[PDB]
Symmetry: C6
Subunit: 91 residues, 6 copies
């Protein structure tokens, strides 16, 4: 599956719980954890459409109350192939 | 084409949704995704003048409500040769 | 043990006092100290479930009044295998 | 010419338009684009005194309305030779 | 001596005066100067307990009025050996 | 001489104008320009005690109205040998 799920948080601790809740929620693979600058952290997962939708909803609910909380939660079920050049394949 | 499109966001998730909307909207290549410092991210595209105009406006409309949102959307249809030395050629 | 403890602070001094209180409070190993960006720091410990619970609560109580203070204190007693790829094994 | 022109902005997008407006305004060479930290970006040009004065005035006017806008615009027509050791020669 | 002293400041200038006041105040060795992110800077010294206590008190008083001032001032007279893996030995 | 002068600013443009005013004001060498994190920049000079005093006060008066301005201006006429290990010798 090539659908993409993304959760952005303030700090690394909410991000690490988001990643746990996502990967326990459905069959998805964790491809990236990016320190964006100025406090933001983003975790990326790939999998099938049904799986990525459940994973992102679970991560969003689990990290909102942790540390400085949630920034963004977002799905793109089929990115353009051009966007693959800025998406990591391994953490 | 050598027209330049650029979109700056707060955080990485609005920038990836910006990159996706831009490349599906017209024939543009993604030449870079830059971590600016302090939370800003900038995505950059190249192509013919009309393609880049259609691309930039679609990415702005798409990322506006994603995460912490949109900072800038802007076009330079023919940069001076000088500026090419600070523009990346692939991301 | 493979339970995970995490404490996020504003600045490096509250995080080192957090690491000290955590490791003296129960049998946990210090696997990482991460400079997150924008001032956040995160310290991470591993061990059995009860050791990590006692560790995390002691570090929170210790760093709360140090410097700019505590951001998050949180435990994941069995992370998914997926998340292991973004957790450091030594600092 | 060895006079120096400098424009500092919030974000990379206003900086890239500043560089375009400067180099289209008079004969100057673009020597640097620096990510300062915490959002600031600085572009540096060199050339003759008359040229650097026109270039900086044009860049300042062109970038004020772009993204998060302008921070500083400044000329030094002849830096001390000691200052050359912190001025880049190539972008 | 293995006791640890720590001073965190906003900016590098208050940190450099803190380090001067600490090392002139008692026999301590300067082991680290860390750029934490988002403006914070931390200086670390080691020595005996009596020496580290005088050093930190002097540094704290000397840097409060310099630049953007003091963030934290803190002693741990005997860190756990696990914490040694995140403490530098040389600046 | 081994007296130390230091000026901290918000952004890179006020710091370069600070470096220029300092080196033209008396016989001082520029030993470093440090990107601190979060937007702060620090420039550092060495020389005899009177040269460094004249240098520092001139740089403060010059950069005050440039960009986001001046954070600190400060002199240490004889640092302890300990601190030399965190001071750069050339920029």
């Amino acid at each position: 599956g090539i659908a993409l799920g993304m959760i952005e948080t303030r700090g690394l601790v909410p991000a690490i719980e988001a990643a746990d809740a996502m990967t326990k929620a459905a069959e998805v693979r964790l491809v990236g954890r990016q320190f964006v600058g100025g406090g933001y952290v983003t975790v990326l997962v790939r999998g099938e459409t049904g799986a990525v939708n459940a994973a992102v909803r679970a991560g969003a609910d689990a990290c909102e109350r942790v540390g400085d909380g949630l920034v963004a939660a977002h799905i793109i079920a089929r990115v353009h192939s051009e966007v693959e050049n800025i998406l990591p394949k391994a953490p």
